[PDB]
């Protein structure tokens, strides 16, 4: 067991493990979104790339939490990873709306854990979330909301044209 | 007081201070326009960048006038800076129309001060405006009018599509 | 409106807009201080440079707050900018005393907003101020207090000599 | 005679020749000021350098006027060059006051010639003065007034100390 653990509550330990699960779930969702937009009958490469990048980012967030768990002397515990919510993700607009829902859920879990850390007087935990998670999440959600706005403006009366143009002229390919 | 002042009227001194106010006002207007187009529910980065650049340019014009005021032995006097005329700026077309109105007002103030300088036989003042302001202003207004024309051509029956395409393919991002 | 806003109170939004006004006011004060020390009958270049640098720094602080406002889904709202408190700023000592007063006011506004953010359980806001404002402000006030001390030591019975030497040997020109 | 002369009045031609004389006179004054501050019993190298630089600048101004005279098809006519007004120039403060008097006289001659050119509808002459003389003169007078202010601040009750320090810490050596 730990010879190092200090000021690290069972409650925070458990909430960290749960958050790891949420980040790995989110990573899996993004993997599925990326491969959906890689389908020959969907074929939006910049959309595929956007979500594949996010799958990696979420995996990396989970890994940072697990590294932290160990640094503090807690025990990483893994649970089953549920599959994503959909098998087919509709339009780029549908997908970006689902992604923002997902991110708002992750953000609320970060805030909840921050609040628990504050209540437990665990400033290392609070600082960790502030330094590596909270602003990264705010920036991502801003980016998604910007994307959503542009996608919505492009629907007009020519949805296919708008969806092509967004992928070509906003997203990286 | 000044040991240096020569051929520098009170009328020109006061008109310079007023012009400084007009340029700082214009800078503030452009700051507001830039942050409006940075909103997640507006999200037109190239439009944001265009107006932020102008906020800087107008600040720089004010600073050059203040430097000149001191070179001539006049006294810089600052007044309250009124807030911009709008809190929300509508479409790119709305914004570019407002910007041209603003620039025509600044240009007329430059012309008025030039005429005062001519009447006061102040060739340094007249040369200063000719060398650093008048052509810069004519060039900017030409650019804005070119932009306006392109924006107008793109309204068609698909305003959102046209507004996206202008931002993507004309403005720098 | 925002599709992104989360955990961002109306109270914090409004306090951010007010703080923007305070930073732009401070920027305007520094602009006036800089041009005062550029007067031919004042002529203290290093003092001019010090305050001009600060005018830029304060503008940049306002811009960071406005960027943050948008990242969080709040709405930037601009108000009139009052003119600086003085038209002529006296000695270098007078000016540095006024600058420290100004900075202590800005610092107290940062602390007040931090406290509001804490009360509203808004850790992103709190982290933002900690990461980009609070230490920058403490460092600036330390620098000003160091300057004040040196200026005061140099008054002696030869104020002009001391004011020249401080500008030449402490301040950057 | 000229095959080229066009829109170049006798009045402007003569005023140009007179202005050449004034610039060469000023150059001679600066030569004398420079060698005065090079005296072993004066020995202020940075003051010497400042005035020697100006002797060159004024010579160059005369040369530009003479080049212009020829470009326009006028005839350069040289007159006797009176010696400078003093054989010994007193303190640095005395000298800088005399230099500002001299420069204000040159500046008024530039303005007078500009006005003559305007009256004669000679825009090349007017542009020539605006482009190469008027702002150069305003900038020099500003510099001198800045110097004067610093010199005056340093008199205090220790004139020698102040005169040494100005030469060492403001002027280039
Ligand atoms: Cl199981
Ligand atoms: Cl007022
Ligand atoms: Cl108002
Ligand atoms: Cl003779």
mmCIF file with all atom_site columns, C-alpha atoms in Angstrom, chain C residues 38-45 157-165 167-169 173, chain D residues 142 145-147 149-150 153-158 161-162 165-171:
data_model
loop_
_atom_site.group_PDB
_atom_site.id
_atom_site.type_symbol
_atom_site.label_atom_id
_atom_site.label_alt_id
_atom_site.label_comp_id
_atom_site.label_asym_id
_atom_site.label_entity_id
_atom_site.label_seq_id
_atom_site.pdbx_PDB_ins_code
_atom_site.Cartn_x
_atom_site.Cartn_y
_atom_site.Cartn_z
_atom_site.occupancy
_atom_site.B_iso_or_equiv
_atom_site.pdbx_formal_charge
_atom_site.auth_seq_id
_atom_site.auth_comp_id
_atom_site.auth_asym_id
_atom_site.auth_atom_id
_atom_site.pdbx_PDB_model_num
ATOM 1  C CA . UNK C 1 38  ? 7.248  63.752 -23.555 1.00 0.00 ? 38  UNK C CA 1
ATOM 2  C CA . UNK C 1 39  ? 6.530  67.556 -23.281 1.00 0.00 ? 39  UNK C CA 1
ATOM 3  C CA . UNK C 1 40  ? 9.511  69.723 -24.233 1.00 0.00 ? 40  UNK C CA 1
ATOM 4  C CA . UNK C 1 41  ? 9.133  71.479 -20.822 1.00 0.00 ? 41  UNK C CA 1
ATOM 5  C CA . UNK C 1 42  ? 9.209  68.151 -18.961 1.00 0.00 ? 42  UNK C CA 1
ATOM 6  C CA . UNK C 1 43  ? 11.449 66.038 -21.168 1.00 0.00 ? 43  UNK C CA 1
ATOM 7  C CA . UNK C 1 44  ? 12.022 62.853 -19.172 1.00 0.00 ? 44  UNK C CA 1
ATOM 8  C CA . UNK C 1 45  ? 12.222 60.175 -21.851 1.00 0.00 ? 45  UNK C CA 1
ATOM 9  C CA . UNK C 1 157 ? 18.144 69.244 -1.362  1.00 0.00 ? 157 UNK C CA 1
ATOM 10 C CA . UNK C 1 158 ? 18.595 69.027 -5.157  1.00 0.00 ? 158 UNK C CA 1
ATOM 11 C CA . UNK C 1 159 ? 15.289 67.835 -6.599  1.00 0.00 ? 159 UNK C CA 1
ATOM 12 C CA . UNK C 1 160 ? 16.044 68.530 -10.259 1.00 0.00 ? 160 UNK C CA 1
ATOM 13 C CA . UNK C 1 161 ? 19.402 66.736 -10.138 1.00 0.00 ? 161 UNK C CA 1
ATOM 14 C CA . UNK C 1 162 ? 17.750 63.704 -8.471  1.00 0.00 ? 162 UNK C CA 1
ATOM 15 C CA . UNK C 1 163 ? 14.911 63.594 -10.994 1.00 0.00 ? 163 UNK C CA 1
ATOM 16 C CA . UNK C 1 164 ? 17.350 63.697 -13.907 1.00 0.00 ? 164 UNK C CA 1
ATOM 17 C CA . UNK C 1 165 ? 19.559 60.993 -12.407 1.00 0.00 ? 165 UNK C CA 1
ATOM 18 C CA . UNK C 1 167 ? 15.441 58.947 -15.306 1.00 0.00 ? 167 UNK C CA 1
ATOM 19 C CA . UNK C 1 168 ? 18.953 58.448 -16.705 1.00 0.00 ? 168 UNK C CA 1
ATOM 20 C CA . UNK C 1 169 ? 20.218 55.627 -14.460 1.00 0.00 ? 169 UNK C CA 1
ATOM 21 C CA . UNK C 1 173 ? 15.929 54.908 -22.605 1.00 0.00 ? 173 UNK C CA 1
ATOM 22 C CA . UNK D 2 142 ? 11.918 69.749 -30.128 1.00 0.00 ? 142 UNK D CA 1
ATOM 23 C CA . UNK D 2 145 ? 13.915 72.274 -26.181 1.00 0.00 ? 145 UNK D CA 1
ATOM 24 C CA . UNK D 2 146 ? 14.128 68.871 -24.471 1.00 0.00 ? 146 UNK D CA 1
ATOM 25 C CA . UNK D 2 147 ? 17.857 69.470 -23.925 1.00 0.00 ? 147 UNK D CA 1
ATOM 26 C CA . UNK D 2 149 ? 14.762 71.634 -20.034 1.00 0.00 ? 149 UNK D CA 1
ATOM 27 C CA . UNK D 2 150 ? 17.210 68.999 -18.780 1.00 0.00 ? 150 UNK D CA 1
ATOM 28 C CA . UNK D 2 153 ? 16.750 71.175 -14.177 1.00 0.00 ? 153 UNK D CA 1
ATOM 29 C CA . UNK D 2 154 ? 20.449 70.375 -13.509 1.00 0.00 ? 154 UNK D CA 1
ATOM 30 C CA . UNK D 2 155 ? 21.566 73.917 -12.597 1.00 0.00 ? 155 UNK D CA 1
ATOM 31 C CA . UNK D 2 156 ? 20.266 73.586 -9.042  1.00 0.00 ? 156 UNK D CA 1
ATOM 32 C CA . UNK D 2 157 ? 22.923 74.975 -6.654  1.00 0.00 ? 157 UNK D CA 1
ATOM 33 C CA . UNK D 2 158 ? 25.745 72.986 -8.308  1.00 0.00 ? 158 UNK D CA 1
ATOM 34 C CA . UNK D 2 161 ? 28.190 69.186 -11.515 1.00 0.00 ? 161 UNK D CA 1
ATOM 35 C CA . UNK D 2 162 ? 24.975 69.561 -13.571 1.00 0.00 ? 162 UNK D CA 1
ATOM 36 C CA . UNK D 2 165 ? 26.353 65.209 -15.870 1.00 0.00 ? 165 UNK D CA 1
ATOM 37 C CA . UNK D 2 166 ? 24.302 66.470 -18.815 1.00 0.00 ? 166 UNK D CA 1
ATOM 38 C CA . UNK D 2 167 ? 27.290 66.109 -21.148 1.00 0.00 ? 167 UNK D CA 1
ATOM 39 C CA . UNK D 2 168 ? 28.095 62.626 -19.821 1.00 0.00 ? 168 UNK D CA 1
ATOM 40 C CA . UNK D 2 169 ? 24.587 61.132 -19.572 1.00 0.00 ? 169 UNK D CA 1
ATOM 41 C CA . UNK D 2 170 ? 22.511 62.863 -22.282 1.00 0.00 ? 170 UNK D CA 1
ATOM 42 C CA . UNK D 2 171 ? 24.952 63.773 -25.070 1.00 0.00 ? 171 UNK D CA 1
#
